[PDB]
Write a protein that holds these residues in place. Structure first.
Motif, PDB file in Angstrom:
ATOM      1  N   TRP B  10       0.872  -1.155   0.000  1.00 38.96           N
ATOM      2  CA  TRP B  10       0.000   0.000   0.000  1.00 38.96           C
ATOM      3  C   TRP B  10       0.926   1.226   0.000  1.00 38.96           C
ATOM      4  CZ3 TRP B  10      -1.270  -4.708   1.818  1.00 38.96           C
ATOM      5  CH2 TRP B  10      -2.605  -5.132   1.706  1.00 38.96           C
ATOM      6  N   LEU B  11       0.754   2.096  -0.986  1.00 36.09           N
ATOM      7  CA  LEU B  11       1.604   3.264  -1.169  1.00 36.09           C
ATOM      8  C   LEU B  11       1.233   4.294  -0.140  1.00 36.09           C
ATOM      9  CD1 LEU B  11       1.611   3.756  -5.057  1.00 36.09           C
ATOM     10  CD2 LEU B  11       3.622   3.048  -3.696  1.00 36.09           C
ATOM     11  N   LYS B  12       2.218   5.094   0.298  1.00 34.10           N
ATOM     12  CA  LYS B  12       1.965   6.281   1.135  1.00 34.10           C
ATOM     13  C   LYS B  12       1.061   7.268   0.407  1.00 34.10           C
ATOM     14  CE  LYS B  12       6.161   6.129   3.926  1.00 34.10           C
ATOM     15  NZ  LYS B  12       7.233   6.975   4.540  1.00 34.10           N
ATOM     16  N   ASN B  13       1.228   7.340  -0.908  1.00 33.56           N
ATOM     17  CA  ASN B  13       0.467   8.194  -1.794  1.00 33.56           C
ATOM     18  C   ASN B  13      -0.324   7.304  -2.741  1.00 33.56           C
ATOM     19  OD1 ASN B  13       1.685  10.681  -0.977  1.00 33.56           O
ATOM     20  ND2 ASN B  13       3.510  10.215  -2.207  1.00 33.56           N
ATOM     21  N   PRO B  14      -1.430   6.689  -2.285  1.00 34.96           N
ATOM     22  CA  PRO B  14      -2.108   5.778  -3.178  1.00 34.96           C
ATOM     23  C   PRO B  14      -2.572   6.472  -4.455  1.00 34.96           C
ATOM     24  CG  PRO B  14      -3.015   5.639  -0.976  1.00 34.96           C
ATOM     25  CD  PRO B  14      -2.099   6.793  -0.975  1.00 34.96           C
ATOM     26  N   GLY B  15      -2.544   5.737  -5.562  1.00 38.57           N
ATOM     27  CA  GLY B  15      -2.975   6.360  -6.826  1.00 38.57           C
ATOM     28  C   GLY B  15      -1.930   7.292  -7.446  1.00 38.57           C
ATOM     29  N   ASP B  16      -0.777   7.482  -6.778  1.00 37.29           N
ATOM     30  CA  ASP B  16       0.295   8.278  -7.373  1.00 37.29           C
ATOM     31  C   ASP B  16       1.065   7.409  -8.355  1.00 37.29           C
ATOM     32  OD1 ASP B  16       3.175   9.420  -7.517  1.00 37.29           O
ATOM     33  OD2 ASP B  16       1.903  11.068  -6.812  1.00 37.29           O
ATOM     34  N   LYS B  17       0.812   7.627  -9.641  1.00 38.09           N
ATOM     35  CA  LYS B  17       1.397   6.815 -10.673  1.00 38.09           C
ATOM     36  C   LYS B  17       2.935   6.801 -10.671  1.00 38.09           C
ATOM     37  CE  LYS B  17       1.359   6.309 -15.693  1.00 38.09           C
ATOM     38  NZ  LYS B  17       1.359   4.861 -15.715  1.00 38.09           N
ATOM     39  N   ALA B  18       3.547   7.966 -10.493  1.00 40.33           N
ATOM     40  CA  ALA B  18       5.007   8.034 -10.381  1.00 40.33           C
ATOM     41  C   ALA B  18       5.587   7.132  -9.303  1.00 40.33           C
ATOM     42  CB  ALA B  18       5.463   9.478 -10.182  1.00 40.33           C
ATOM     43  N   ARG B  20       4.009   4.552  -7.839  1.00 42.95           N
ATOM     44  CA  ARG B  20       3.658   3.197  -8.224  1.00 42.95           C
ATOM     45  C   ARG B  20       4.646   2.664  -9.241  1.00 42.95           C
ATOM     46  NH1 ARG B  20      -1.585   3.880  -9.789  1.00 42.95           N
ATOM     47  NH2 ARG B  20      -0.938   3.978 -11.968  1.00 42.95           N
ATOM     48  N   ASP B  21       4.876   3.434 -10.298  1.00 43.34           N
ATOM     49  CA  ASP B  21       5.825   2.984 -11.334  1.00 43.34           C
ATOM     50  C   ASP B  21       7.231   2.756 -10.784  1.00 43.34           C
ATOM     51  OD1 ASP B  21       3.768   3.045 -13.202  1.00 43.34           O
ATOM     52  OD2 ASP B  21       4.458   4.945 -14.100  1.00 43.34           O
ATOM     53  N   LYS B  22       7.648   3.610  -9.867  1.00 43.30           N
ATOM     54  CA  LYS B  22       8.970   3.474  -9.241  1.00 43.30           C
ATOM     55  C   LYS B  22       9.059   2.159  -8.449  1.00 43.30           C
ATOM     56  N   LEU B  23       8.013   1.877  -7.683  1.00 49.34           N
ATOM     57  CA  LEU B  23       7.937   0.641  -6.937  1.00 49.34           C
ATOM     58  C   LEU B  23       7.951  -0.613  -7.840  1.00 49.34           C
ATOM     59  CD1 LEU B  23       7.783  -0.964  -4.279  1.00 49.34           C
ATOM     60  CD2 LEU B  23       5.272  -0.344  -4.208  1.00 49.34           C
ATOM     61  N   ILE B  24       7.177  -0.591  -8.914  1.00 49.38           N
ATOM     62  CA  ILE B  24       7.102  -1.660  -9.871  1.00 49.38           C
ATOM     63  C   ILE B  24       8.471  -1.883 -10.495  1.00 49.38           C
ATOM     64  CG2 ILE B  24       6.127  -2.273 -12.220  1.00 49.38           C
ATOM     65  CD1 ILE B  24       3.563  -0.808 -11.210  1.00 49.38           C
ATOM     66  N   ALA B  25       9.104  -0.791 -10.917  1.00 49.35           N
ATOM     67  CA  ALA B  25      10.378  -0.884 -11.585  1.00 49.35           C
ATOM     68  C   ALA B  25      11.419  -1.456 -10.630  1.00 49.35           C
ATOM     69  CB  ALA B  25      10.771   0.513 -12.075  1.00 49.35           C
ATOM     70  N   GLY B  26      11.366  -1.025  -9.377  1.00 43.75           N
ATOM     71  CA  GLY B  26      12.302  -1.513  -8.371  1.00 43.75           C
ATOM     72  C   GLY B  26      12.161  -3.016  -8.088  1.00 43.75           C
ATOM     73  N   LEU B  27      10.914  -3.480  -8.026  1.00 47.83           N
ATOM     74  CA  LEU B  27      10.613  -4.894  -7.881  1.00 47.83           C
ATOM     75  C   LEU B  27      11.108  -5.716  -9.082  1.00 47.83           C
ATOM     76  CD1 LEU B  27       7.117  -4.519  -6.280  1.00 47.83           C
ATOM     77  CD2 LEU B  27       9.187  -5.698  -5.238  1.00 47.83           C
ATOM     78  N   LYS B  28      10.778  -5.282 -10.291  1.00 51.34           N
ATOM     79  CA  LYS B  28      11.185  -5.983 -11.489  1.00 51.34           C
ATOM     80  C   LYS B  28      12.678  -6.140 -11.611  1.00 51.34           C
ATOM     81  CE  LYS B  28       7.167  -5.186 -14.387  1.00 51.34           C
ATOM     82  NZ  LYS B  28       6.781  -4.936 -15.814  1.00 51.34           N
ATOM     83  N   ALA B  29      13.439  -5.145 -11.161  1.00 51.47           N
ATOM     84  CA  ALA B  29      14.895  -5.200 -11.258  1.00 51.47           C
ATOM     85  C   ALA B  29      15.517  -6.229 -10.340  1.00 51.47           C
ATOM     86  CB  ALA B  29      15.507  -3.846 -10.976  1.00 51.47           C
ATOM     87  N   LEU B  30      14.745  -6.784  -9.406  1.00 47.69           N
ATOM     88  CA  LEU B  30      15.257  -7.855  -8.567  1.00 47.69           C
ATOM     89  C   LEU B  30      15.529  -9.165  -9.349  1.00 47.69           C
ATOM     90  CD1 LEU B  30      13.061  -7.074  -5.369  1.00 47.69           C
ATOM     91  CD2 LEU B  30      15.548  -6.713  -5.578  1.00 47.69           C
ATOM     92  N   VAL B  53     -12.846  -9.839  -1.622  1.00 43.80           N
ATOM     93  CA  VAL B  53     -11.698  -9.349  -2.446  1.00 43.80           C
ATOM     94  C   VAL B  53     -11.158  -8.048  -1.912  1.00 43.80           C
ATOM     95  CG1 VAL B  53     -10.809  -8.514  -4.728  1.00 43.80           C
ATOM     96  CG2 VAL B  53     -12.523 -10.416  -4.620  1.00 43.80           C
ATOM     97  N   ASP B  54      -9.876  -8.040  -1.577  1.00 44.93           N
ATOM     98  CA  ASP B  54      -9.207  -6.790  -1.160  1.00 44.93           C
ATOM     99  C   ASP B  54      -8.568  -6.250  -2.427  1.00 44.93           C
ATOM    100  OD1 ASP B  54      -7.766  -4.735  -0.129  1.00 44.93           O
ATOM    101  OD2 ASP B  54      -6.832  -5.887   1.508  1.00 44.93           O
ATOM    102  N   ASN B  55      -9.076  -5.112  -2.902  1.00 48.51           N
ATOM    103  CA  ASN B  55      -8.481  -4.406  -4.045  1.00 48.51           C
ATOM    104  C   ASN B  55      -7.814  -3.098  -3.624  1.00 48.51           C
ATOM    105  OD1 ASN B  55     -10.799  -2.931  -3.602  1.00 48.51           O
ATOM    106  ND2 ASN B  55     -11.271  -2.659  -5.807  1.00 48.51           N
ATOM    107  N   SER B  56      -7.495  -2.973  -2.348  1.00 49.08           N
ATOM    108  CA  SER B  56      -7.021  -1.692  -1.823  1.00 49.08           C
ATOM    109  C   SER B  56      -5.530  -1.459  -1.878  1.00 49.08           C
ATOM    110  CB  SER B  56      -7.512  -1.524  -0.417  1.00 49.08           C
ATOM    111  OG  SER B  56      -6.867  -2.353   0.502  1.00 49.08           O
ATOM    112  N   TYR B  57      -4.755  -2.523  -2.060  1.00 47.02           N
ATOM    113  CA  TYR B  57      -3.328  -2.412  -2.262  1.00 47.02           C
ATOM    114  C   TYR B  57      -3.064  -1.772  -3.624  1.00 47.02           C
ATOM    115  CZ  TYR B  57      -3.985  -6.549  -5.155  1.00 47.02           C
ATOM    116  OH  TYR B  57      -4.480  -7.442  -6.074  1.00 47.02           O
ATOM    117  N   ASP B  58      -1.850  -1.253  -3.796  1.00 46.66           N
ATOM    118  CA  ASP B  58      -1.449  -0.598  -4.999  1.00 46.66           C
ATOM    119  C   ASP B  58      -0.595  -1.492  -5.932  1.00 46.66           C
ATOM    120  OD1 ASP B  58      -2.325   2.304  -4.626  1.00 46.66           O
ATOM    121  OD2 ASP B  58      -1.418   1.825  -2.703  1.00 46.66           O
TER     122      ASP B  58
END
Lengths: 102, 102
Positions: B10-18, B20-30, B53-58
Protein backbone atom coordinates in the motif's frame (compact mmCIF):
# COMPACT_ATOMS: atom_id res chain seq x y z
CA UNK A 1 -0.81 -9.12 -18.54
CA UNK A 2 -2.23 -12.24 -16.87
CA UNK A 3 -4.61 -12.45 -13.94
CA UNK A 4 -3.34 -13.86 -10.61
CA UNK A 5 -6.18 -15.06 -8.38
CA UNK A 6 -4.85 -15.57 -4.86
CA UNK A 7 -7.00 -16.90 -2.01
CA UNK A 8 -6.11 -17.63 1.64
CA UNK A 9 -8.41 -19.82 3.75
CA UNK A 10 -8.67 -20.05 7.52
CA UNK A 11 -10.24 -23.35 8.63
CA UNK A 12 -13.06 -23.48 11.20
CA UNK A 13 -10.91 -26.16 12.83
CA UNK A 14 -7.38 -24.86 12.32
CA UNK A 15 -4.71 -27.56 12.39
CA UNK A 16 -7.32 -30.26 11.63
CA UNK A 17 -5.46 -32.29 9.04
CA UNK A 18 -8.57 -34.10 7.75
CA UNK A 19 -10.35 -30.81 7.00
CA UNK A 20 -7.20 -29.28 5.55
CA UNK A 21 -6.65 -32.26 3.27
CA UNK A 22 -10.30 -32.16 2.17
CA UNK A 23 -9.99 -28.48 1.30
CA UNK A 24 -6.72 -29.05 -0.60
CA UNK A 25 -8.17 -31.97 -2.51
CA UNK A 26 -11.27 -29.95 -3.38
CA UNK A 27 -9.17 -27.06 -4.70
CA UNK A 28 -6.89 -29.33 -6.76
CA UNK A 29 -9.87 -30.97 -8.45
CA UNK A 30 -10.82 -27.63 -9.97
CA UNK A 31 -8.14 -28.49 -12.65
CA UNK A 32 -11.24 -29.82 -14.51
CA UNK A 33 -12.06 -26.19 -15.41
CA UNK A 34 -10.22 -25.50 -18.70
CA UNK A 35 -9.95 -21.69 -18.30
CA UNK A 36 -7.48 -22.22 -15.39
CA UNK A 37 -3.95 -21.85 -16.79
CA UNK A 38 -2.17 -22.76 -13.57
CA UNK A 39 -3.45 -24.05 -10.24
CA UNK A 40 -1.23 -24.07 -7.11
CA UNK A 41 -2.36 -25.00 -3.61
CA UNK A 42 -0.17 -24.52 -0.54
CA UNK A 43 0.16 -24.06 3.22
CA UNK A 44 2.24 -21.63 5.21
CA UNK A 45 5.99 -22.08 4.64
CA UNK A 46 8.43 -22.39 7.55
CA UNK A 47 9.98 -19.01 6.54
CA UNK A 48 11.34 -16.72 9.25
CA UNK A 49 8.26 -15.40 11.03
CA UNK A 50 8.59 -11.69 10.50
CA UNK A 51 6.03 -9.19 11.70
CA UNK A 52 4.86 -8.49 8.12
CA UNK A 53 4.35 -12.25 7.35
CA UNK A 54 0.89 -13.67 7.99
CA UNK A 55 1.31 -17.41 8.58
CA UNK A 56 -2.09 -17.84 10.22
CA UNK A 57 -4.07 -19.13 7.26
CA UNK A 58 -4.32 -22.87 6.75
CA UNK A 59 -4.51 -23.23 2.93
CA UNK A 60 -3.49 -20.95 0.05
CA UNK A 61 -4.59 -21.12 -3.63
CA UNK A 62 -3.08 -19.43 -6.66
CA UNK A 63 -4.78 -19.58 -10.03
CA UNK A 64 -3.67 -17.87 -13.22
CA UNK A 65 -6.10 -16.77 -15.93
CA UNK A 66 -5.47 -15.20 -19.31
CA UNK A 67 -8.07 -12.51 -18.73
CA UNK A 68 -10.75 -11.06 -16.48
CA UNK A 69 -13.36 -12.70 -18.81
CA UNK A 70 -11.78 -16.14 -18.25
CA UNK A 71 -11.78 -15.57 -14.52
CA UNK A 72 -15.46 -14.64 -14.83
CA UNK A 73 -16.09 -17.97 -16.60
CA UNK A 74 -14.35 -19.77 -13.74
CA UNK A 75 -16.46 -17.83 -11.22
CA UNK A 76 -19.66 -18.97 -12.97
CA UNK A 77 -18.47 -22.54 -13.58
CA UNK A 78 -20.71 -25.29 -12.06
CA UNK A 79 -17.65 -27.12 -10.76
CA UNK A 80 -16.61 -24.15 -8.70
CA UNK A 81 -20.17 -23.90 -7.31
CA UNK A 82 -19.99 -27.59 -6.40
CA UNK A 83 -16.68 -27.00 -4.61
CA UNK A 84 -18.14 -24.17 -2.56
CA UNK A 85 -21.19 -26.32 -1.74
CA UNK A 86 -18.98 -29.29 -0.86
CA UNK A 87 -16.27 -27.43 1.06
CA UNK A 88 -17.38 -24.03 2.39
CA UNK A 89 -18.32 -25.50 5.77
CA UNK A 90 -14.58 -26.15 6.29
CA UNK A 91 -13.52 -22.48 6.42
CA UNK A 92 -14.33 -19.56 8.69
CA UNK A 93 -12.65 -16.76 6.73
CA UNK A 94 -11.30 -16.18 3.20
CA UNK A 95 -9.26 -13.31 1.72
CA UNK A 96 -8.97 -12.94 -2.06
CA UNK A 97 -6.46 -10.81 -4.01
CA UNK A 98 -7.00 -10.57 -7.76
CA UNK A 99 -3.99 -8.96 -9.50
CA UNK A 100 -3.31 -8.17 -13.18
CA UNK A 101 0.36 -8.44 -14.06
CA UNK A 102 2.22 -5.36 -15.26
CA UNK B 1 6.91 -28.31 -3.29
CA UNK B 2 7.99 -24.80 -4.29
CA UNK B 3 7.86 -21.63 -2.24
CA UNK B 4 5.42 -18.85 -3.24
CA UNK B 5 6.42 -15.47 -1.80
CA UNK B 6 3.49 -13.08 -2.14
CA UNK B 7 3.67 -9.43 -1.07
CA UNK B 8 1.04 -6.65 -1.27
CA UNK B 9 2.11 -3.01 -0.92
CA UNK B 10 0.00 0.00 0.00
CA UNK B 11 1.60 3.26 -1.17
CA UNK B 12 1.96 6.28 1.13
CA UNK B 13 0.47 8.19 -1.79
CA UNK B 14 -2.11 5.78 -3.18
CA UNK B 15 -2.97 6.36 -6.83
CA UNK B 16 0.30 8.28 -7.37
CA UNK B 17 1.40 6.82 -10.67
CA UNK B 18 5.01 8.03 -10.38
CA UNK B 19 5.48 6.30 -7.02
CA UNK B 20 3.66 3.20 -8.22
CA UNK B 21 5.83 2.98 -11.33
CA UNK B 22 8.97 3.47 -9.24
CA UNK B 23 7.94 0.64 -6.94
CA UNK B 24 7.10 -1.66 -9.87
CA UNK B 25 10.38 -0.88 -11.58
CA UNK B 26 12.30 -1.51 -8.37
CA UNK B 27 10.61 -4.89 -7.88
CA UNK B 28 11.18 -5.98 -11.49
CA UNK B 29 14.89 -5.20 -11.26
CA UNK B 30 15.26 -7.86 -8.57
CA UNK B 31 15.43 -10.34 -11.55
CA UNK B 32 19.21 -9.82 -11.04
CA UNK B 33 18.99 -12.21 -8.07
CA UNK B 34 19.53 -15.71 -9.53
CA UNK B 35 17.68 -17.67 -6.78
CA UNK B 36 14.36 -16.14 -8.00
CA UNK B 37 12.69 -18.69 -10.29
CA UNK B 38 9.78 -16.46 -11.28
CA UNK B 39 9.05 -12.80 -10.61
CA UNK B 40 5.58 -11.30 -11.24
CA UNK B 41 4.50 -7.78 -10.36
CA UNK B 42 0.90 -6.60 -10.62
CA UNK B 43 -1.86 -4.20 -9.56
CA UNK B 44 -5.43 -4.87 -8.58
CA UNK B 45 -7.47 -6.43 -11.40
CA UNK B 46 -10.85 -5.01 -12.44
CA UNK B 47 -12.54 -8.23 -11.16
CA UNK B 48 -16.02 -8.03 -9.66
CA UNK B 49 -15.52 -6.31 -6.31
CA UNK B 50 -16.79 -8.91 -3.91
CA UNK B 51 -16.72 -8.48 -0.17
CA UNK B 52 -13.93 -11.08 0.21
CA UNK B 53 -11.70 -9.35 -2.45
CA UNK B 54 -9.21 -6.79 -1.16
CA UNK B 55 -8.48 -4.41 -4.04
CA UNK B 56 -7.02 -1.69 -1.82
CA UNK B 57 -3.33 -2.41 -2.26
CA UNK B 58 -1.45 -0.60 -5.00
CA UNK B 59 1.21 -3.15 -6.09
CA UNK B 60 1.48 -6.93 -5.76
CA UNK B 61 4.60 -9.14 -6.10
CA UNK B 62 4.84 -12.90 -6.54
CA UNK B 63 8.17 -14.67 -6.42
CA UNK B 64 8.78 -18.40 -6.65
CA UNK B 65 11.74 -20.12 -4.98
CA UNK B 66 12.84 -23.73 -5.05
CA UNK B 67 13.25 -23.84 -1.29
CA UNK B 68 13.14 -22.01 2.02
CA UNK B 69 16.99 -21.84 1.87
CA UNK B 70 16.85 -20.07 -1.52
CA UNK B 71 14.29 -17.64 -0.18
CA UNK B 72 16.66 -17.02 2.74
CA UNK B 73 19.44 -16.23 0.24
CA UNK B 74 17.12 -13.75 -1.47
CA UNK B 75 16.26 -12.20 1.90
CA UNK B 76 19.97 -11.66 2.63
CA UNK B 77 20.87 -10.54 -0.90
CA UNK B 78 22.47 -7.04 -1.15
CA UNK B 79 20.24 -6.18 -4.10
CA UNK B 80 17.13 -6.72 -2.05
CA UNK B 81 18.61 -4.51 0.71
CA UNK B 82 19.28 -1.83 -1.90
CA UNK B 83 15.67 -2.07 -3.11
CA UNK B 84 14.34 -1.61 0.41
CA UNK B 85 16.71 1.34 0.94
CA UNK B 86 15.75 2.85 -2.42
CA UNK B 87 12.00 2.21 -2.27
CA UNK B 88 10.66 1.69 1.26
CA UNK B 89 9.72 5.36 1.60
CA UNK B 90 7.09 4.72 -1.10
CA UNK B 91 4.91 2.37 0.98
CA UNK B 92 2.96 2.70 4.21
CA UNK B 93 1.99 -0.95 4.73
CA UNK B 94 3.07 -4.38 3.44
CA UNK B 95 1.53 -7.85 3.92
CA UNK B 96 3.57 -10.96 3.08
CA UNK B 97 2.29 -14.53 2.60
CA UNK B 98 4.92 -17.24 2.18
CA UNK B 99 3.35 -20.54 1.06
CA UNK B 100 4.90 -23.96 0.30
CA UNK B 101 3.04 -25.82 -2.41
CA UNK B 102 1.38 -29.13 -1.60
Amino acid sequence: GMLFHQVFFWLKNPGDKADRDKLIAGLKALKAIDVIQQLHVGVPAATEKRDVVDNSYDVSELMVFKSVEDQKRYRDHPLLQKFVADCSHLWSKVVVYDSMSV
